[PDB]
Write a protein that binds this ligand. Structure first.
Ligand SMILES: CCn1cc(CC(=O)Nc2ccc(Oc3ncnc4cc(OC)c(OC)cc34)cc2)cn1
Length: 298
């Protein structure tokens, strides 16, 4: 359902700026909205819209994303809906909260050198280094966001560090770029039949049986944990993503531990990658386990 009296924002109160990243049939644009959340207050926002080449099919898909966002509602660890421009005479525009540091994969990679496992007093205190505490904290926040999405009877289907945005005060948010990411140019997406799929993040029942469940999102979460504790490296380094790769994964071949992990975080990755989906932990279990590691790390 679309509740207009609430979500409809006037096009003349939105000031479009520079494009953020590159898309195929969609585009994300930085903008400044007047009084979208607080009365008569300017606010920087991100706007998702279509571009030249898009058809009626992509327009239906963008409207579906807006309806899903209305249904889900807000949570701290999900990129939240602020409003929309749906009225005739202009393009469909979906307005969300702005996350100033961008996606997590790019962020962690750019800051790989500015990392220390623990801050040793007094010099490290005033230096803005990334630590094990930060990494376990981002991991725990994504598990909380995913537990919330499961509670609303939703499944992600493209969970990865490139679909995590970093906001102020170390808050991370789950998102979905959709066709606002150029998946035809992006090496993370592999051609399989008539489609471009994220093979390195997909569970065996997803690759071989086309089965998508909350437990195959748990498998992708295990991959996301590897990307965080490798500080933005690409999964399965040196491995050719072909028929042999899929065969080995189906027989129990798994990734070796990343460079910045602790033994218990690598053991969490292995559990997420259990061959049997029912034997993988739930998102509620992951929240419990990560919370305890964050208390042990302190
Ligand atoms: C899982 C729940 N769910 C959410 C949806 C819709 C959705 O996530 N839409 C979406 C996704 C990404 C967007 O992009 C950005 N948003 C905020 N800030 C950004 C900041 C950026 O750079 C500093 C930037 O650079 C590339 C991109 C930014 C905008 C809208 C569907 N399901």
């Amino acid at each position: 359902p679309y509740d207009a009296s609430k979500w409809e924002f006037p096009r003349d109160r939105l000031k479009l700026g520079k494009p953020l990243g590159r898309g195929a049939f969609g585009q994300v644009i930085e903008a400044d909205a007047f009084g979208i959340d607080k009365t008569a207050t300017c606010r920087t926002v991100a706007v998702k819209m279509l571009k030249e080449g898009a058809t009626h099919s992509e327009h239906r898909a963008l409207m579906s994303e807006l309806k899903i966002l209305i249904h889900i509602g807000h949570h701290l660890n999900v990129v939240n809906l602020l409003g929309a421009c749906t009225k005739p005479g202009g393009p469909l525009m979906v307005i969300v909260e702005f996350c100033k540091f961008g996606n997590l994969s790019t962020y962690l990679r750019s800051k790989r050198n500015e990392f220390v496992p623990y801050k040793v007093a007094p010099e490290d205190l005033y230096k803005d280094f990334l630590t094990l505490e930060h990494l376990i904290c981002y991991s725990f926040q994504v598990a909380k966001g995913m537990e919330f999405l499961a509670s609303r009877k939703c499944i992600h289907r493209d969970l990865a560090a490139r679909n995590i945005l970093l906001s102020e005060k170390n808050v991370v948010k789950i998102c979905d770029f959709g066709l606002a990411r150029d998946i035809y140019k992006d090496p993370d997406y592999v051609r399989k039949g008539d489609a471009r799929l994220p093979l390195k993040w997909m569970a065996p029942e997803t690759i071989f049986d086309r089965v998508y469940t909350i437990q195959s999102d748990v498998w992708s979460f295990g991959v996301l944990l590897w990307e965080i504790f490798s500080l933005g490296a690409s999964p399965y380094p040196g491995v050719k993503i072909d028929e042999e790769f899929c065969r080995r994964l189906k027989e129990g071949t798994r990734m070796r531990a990343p460079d910045y992990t602790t033994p218990e975080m690598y053991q969490t990755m292995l559990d997420c990658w259990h061959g049997e989906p029912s034997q993988r932990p739930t998102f509620s279990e992951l929240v419990e386990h990560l919370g305890n590691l964050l208390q042990a790390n302190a």
